[PDB]
Amino acid sequence: TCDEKYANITVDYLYNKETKLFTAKLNVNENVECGCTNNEVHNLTECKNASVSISHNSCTAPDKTLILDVPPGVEKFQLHDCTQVEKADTTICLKWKNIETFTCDTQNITYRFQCGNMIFDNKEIKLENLEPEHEYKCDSEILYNNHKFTNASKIIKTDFGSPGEPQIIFCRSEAAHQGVITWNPPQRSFHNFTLCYIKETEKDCLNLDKNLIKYDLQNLKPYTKYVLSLHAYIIAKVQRNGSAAMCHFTTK
Ligand SMILES: *[C@@H]1O[C@H](CO)[C@@H](O)[C@H](O)[C@H]1NC(C)=O
Ligand SMILES: *[C@@H]1O[C@H](CO)[C@@H](O)[C@H](O)[C@H]1NC(C)=O
Ligand SMILES: *[C@@H]1O[C@H](CO)[C@@H](O)[C@H](O)[C@H]1NC(C)=O
Ligand SMILES: *[C@@H]1O[C@H](CO)[C@@H](O)[C@H](O)[C@H]1NC(C)=O
Ligand SMILES: *[C@@H]1O[C@H](CO)[C@@H](O)[C@H](O)[C@H]1NC(C)=O
């Protein structure tokens, strides 16, 4: 009987973004008859059970009554980049968002991701310790009753990382109220330098142009131990500071 021959028949769901309708592809070799041109049932509404009566000349009545459990709307899911701005240079957070309600039960909805060669099974995923200034291709798919109905790829860039630290050539007093700091610039990309002079509980900071490699410090307490801090910062999706290069000298 056709009900016997096709009792365990399987289906693949193909979404049309223009029509907002699904096509059910019947996983059979022979050209089957319904009541389904090229073994495809077209124009199926999302999250609605539809019935198809299947037969073929190679089998007798009763027909196989096949229930199509149609998945949710492909446009109702959005692959969102949830990366926290402060950690954008070393992390990736990807999450599928449910942008519109659907009637399908969510317990039958499964999300899968593939980043490098790592495979994840969850609505959201998080990658850490990534090297800054690189691009990664994360592939993802959504299953309904273990049936893939949608997929997407997300190419993500790991934002400008923290620069430096700079290499201090020297820092010495050259007058009773003066001290000089000279350095070499740090290796990564940055916007400016931040110089600090520390006299015990006291601390005053500055802002130096990326192009300078020397600084003069006037109006200082004579015969006093000073500590200079120097780091370079970059204004990325957040201000990222490089590690500080310490310096010590004592006035004349
Ligand atoms: C139904 O599907 C056919 C193609 O199989 C298409 O030509 C037709 O416009 C669709 N009708 C509706 C109402 O979506
Ligand atoms: C379709 O039918 C099955 C039983 O065959 C039922 O459990 C399921 O809830 C129905 N699908 C939807 C979308 O409600
Ligand atoms: C969905 O998956 C298939 C098979 O892996 C792939 O060929 C297709 O390109 C994917 N869809 C998109 C939009 O990339
Ligand atoms: C660098 O420092 C100067 C002086 O403090 C300032 O005018 C400039 O806007 C700073 N650069 C950036 C990118 O903030
Ligand atoms: C970076 O350094 C500045 C001084 O240059 C400091 O005021 C600020 O707290 C630091 N920024 C961040 C985001 O840690």
Swiss-Prot record:
Annotated ranges, domain Fibronectin type-III: 162-252
Chain positions carrying an annotated carbohydrate: N8, N43, N49, N57, N108, N151, N192, N241
Subcellular location: Cell membrane; Membrane raft; Synapse
Post-translation changes: Heavily N- and O-glycosylated.
Subunit structure: Binds GANAB and PRKCSH. Interacts with SKAP1. Interacts with DPP4; the interaction is enhanced in an interleukin-12-dependent manner in activated lymphocytes. Interacts with CD53; this interaction stabilizes PTPRC on the membrane and is required for optimal phosphatase activity. (Microbial infection) Interacts with human cytomegalovirus protein UL11; the interaction is required for binding of UL11 to T-cells.
Disorder this protein is connected to according to its UniProt record: Multiple sclerosis: A multifactorial, inflammatory, demyelinating disease of the central nervous system. Sclerotic lesions are characterized by perivascular infiltration of monocytes and lymphocytes and appear as indurated areas in pathologic specimens (sclerosis in plaques). The pathological mechanism is regarded as an autoimmune attack of the myelin sheath, mediated by both cellular and humoral immunity. Clinical manifestations include visual loss, extra-ocular movement disorders, paresthesias, loss of sensation, weakness, dysarthria, spasticity, ataxia and bladder dysfunction. Immunodeficiency 105, severe combined: An autosomal recessive disorder characterized by recurrent infections in early infancy, decreased or absent numbers of non-functional T cells, normal or increased levels of B cells, hypogammaglobulinemia, and normal or low NK cells. Clinical manifestations may include pneumonia, dermatitis, and lymphadenopathy.
Notes concerning its domains: The first PTPase domain interacts with SKAP1.
Identification of the protein by name: Receptor-type tyrosine-protein phosphatase C
Covered residues, full protein: 227 to 481 of 1306
